[PDB]
Write a protein that binds this ligand. Structure first.
Ligand SMILES: NCCC(O)(P(=O)(O)O)P(=O)(O)O
Ligand SMILES: NCCC(O)(P(=O)(O)O)P(=O)(O)O
Ligand SMILES: [Mn+2]
Ligand SMILES: [Mn+2]
Ligand SMILES: [Mn+2]
Ligand SMILES: [Mn+2]
Ligand SMILES: [Mn+2]
Ligand SMILES: [Mn+2]
Lengths: 346, 346
């Protein structure tokens, strides 16, 4: 609703992002072909999603800055930093689809899967990352929060990259070992790989832009947001298998990639020793027959019902945390982000 | 010689790099497996090269800072920033071997080619990049050049990444078009993909650490260093085909990858219309028969002799530039880096 009114002005700002990014270096006509590839990469990989993360920067900025201090220019910056978060997203997703061997994303073929692209996607991805820091300098170089943002984004990338490492160490291909799929392992992985960049990053960027740079205040917002992140990854693992592809925009790969999913951790807990053997025998394989066998065990142990219940208990718990931790920040900040991910299907 | 005395103290500092990187996050035992993968990635990909780039930071630091201002701590920082350059190197090389489909590097199998690694190399690479900025913060956070270095490294990455894009746009696989292999195209590609990070990055880092942050002074050092970079990439294209693998540490792939090499640009210039057809018919293919056919045309148009002559005329020209541009900086700074790449075989 608040995200709804802000969407239009955000998405439209994307022309300028691409304009400023493909001009400030176009006084060097030599790299023009590269700059054209940039425009192409940007419009394929930063466009077509829900923009939850970038909108959070924008939405939270308004609720934190006093209306007098929301000038045309100060807002411009808010939309740019919001798109910077969206580019971190694009950067990670491009690489991740390669590493996960994904077939679609946001309802189209993955960038590396487009003919003519392939493993060049790698350099495209690193470029998307570089653009974050180009924009920060072009728009915020003179701001007092400028170094805070630079360090926040880098720190955040390091974290989700430590997250990815954990994710991949836990899911060797051809190497099934249900034993390693524990609750602690799951909790660590999602906290690092999703929670920081998807939830702490946007709100904190908006905080720093609003002057709120206090260490306790960030620690407190972080307490709320790492919890929402963990809920958000669990919902994502569920959708991976049980969500509709025409809605999520992607084809799930968690069982095939031998991933430490939430479903798999929940299965191994409710598993009778004979179901354990089914799972131990059908997980992390490309065979469709064997993947359905796994999905059938999940439906048999009623994981879809367990997940729905978790969603409820989780949502009430985030709410408690917001009650305990939101001040001195407007509870509408976290409430808005929480409403946007509650009962999502994409 | 100057690089020789500094080598030992540099390489040994690498234990501490790995120590500080794998401890400051090890107060979080949850990511310990990731931190262990880090140590592994670092010791495979940041070790085994000539350390020209990192040593340049160190060597140039001493010749720019007054001996009184070279304390234990100030030196420590110099070795760290030197290794930060070495990690940018590792970051780019890891990704590049994947994109170029390389088989070896520094005399061992490429990281992505090690069994168990593969396209996970991608996340390993992004991690190496992240470590640069972790170290900058751990060692230089309080220095007055701290933001200068952060911006220099990012700027440098953006550049070599624009360089890579150019490199890859010019060499589509299965898409031979000798027409695009021009001198201007070559000059742009190498300036962006090599010159900035390999030559300007290290010297400028050492300058900023020494207080020399003036814009004209950097512009002037850059004039020298982008020239040495271009010589350095040309030497690299030559070694790619004509150098000994037991020395370079890598197997060349430029003809197969359909690359805009120096040799190929020089060939197309000296090519009789019938040699042009040979080339047009054997370039950018995996067939060994066809790759030798190409190498034979190069030896026939005497490219190895042309290259030797270029090396001489080039070296004299850099020297002129050093004469014109080195001041107020010690000419020994550039002379040392120039001696280290003159007549190199690896
Ligand atoms: N934000 C991480 C991306 C994923 O959610 P995705 O389903 O690929 O969007 P992963 O399942 O690999 O964690
Ligand atoms: N510094 C770039 C790396 C190379 O030189 P390398 O031979 O792979 O070291 P490229 O030939 O791809 O430019
Ligand atoms: Mn993943
Ligand atoms: Mn994925
Ligand atoms: Mn997923
Ligand atoms: Mn290359
Ligand atoms: Mn290469
Ligand atoms: Mn090469």
């Amino acid at each position: 609703d608040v995200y709804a009114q802000e969407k239009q002005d955000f998405v439209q700002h994307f022309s300028q992002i691409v304009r400023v990014l493909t001009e400030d270096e176009m006084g060097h006509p030599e790299i023009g072909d590269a700059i054209a590839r940039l425009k192409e990469v940007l419009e394929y990989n930063a466009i077509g999603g829900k923009y939850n993360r970038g909108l959070t920067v924008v939405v939270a900025f308004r609720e934190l800055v006093e209306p007098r201090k929301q000038d045309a220019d100060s807002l411009q910056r808010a939309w740019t930093v919001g798109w910077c978060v969206e580019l971190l997203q694009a950067f990670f997703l491009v690489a991740d689809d390669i590493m996960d061997s994904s077939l679609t994303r946001r309802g189209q073929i993955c960038w590396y899967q487009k003919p003519g692209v392939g493993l060049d996607a790698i350099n495209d991805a690193n470029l998307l990352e570089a653009c974050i820091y180009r924009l920060l300098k072009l728009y915020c170089r003179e701001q007092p929060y400028y170094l805070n943002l630079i360090e926040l984004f880098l720190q955040s990338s390091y974290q989700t990259e430590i997250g990815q490492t954990l994710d991949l160490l836990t899911a060797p291909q051809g190497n099934v070992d249900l034993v390693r799929f524990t609750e602690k392992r799951y909790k660590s992985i999602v906290k690092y790989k999703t929670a920081f960049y998807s939830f702490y990053l946007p709100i904190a960027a908006a905080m720093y832009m609003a002057g709120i740079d206090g260490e306790k205040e960030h620690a407190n917002a972080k307490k709320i947001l790492l919890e929402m992140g963990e809920f958000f990854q669990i919902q994502d693992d569920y959708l991976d298998l049980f969500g509709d592809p025409s809605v999520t925009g992607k084809i799930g790969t968690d069982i095939q990639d031998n991933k430490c999913s939430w479903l798999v951790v929940q299965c191994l807990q409710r598993a009778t020793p004979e179901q354990y053997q089914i799972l131990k025998e059908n997980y992390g394989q490309k065979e469709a027959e064997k993947v359905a066998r796994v999905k059938a065990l999940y439906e048999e142990l009623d994981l879809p019902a367990v997940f729905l219940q978790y969603e409820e208990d989780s949502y009430s718990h985030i709410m408690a945390l917001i009650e305990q931790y939101a001040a001195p920040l407007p509870p509408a900040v976290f409430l808005g982000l929480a409403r946007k991910i509650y009962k999502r299907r994409k």
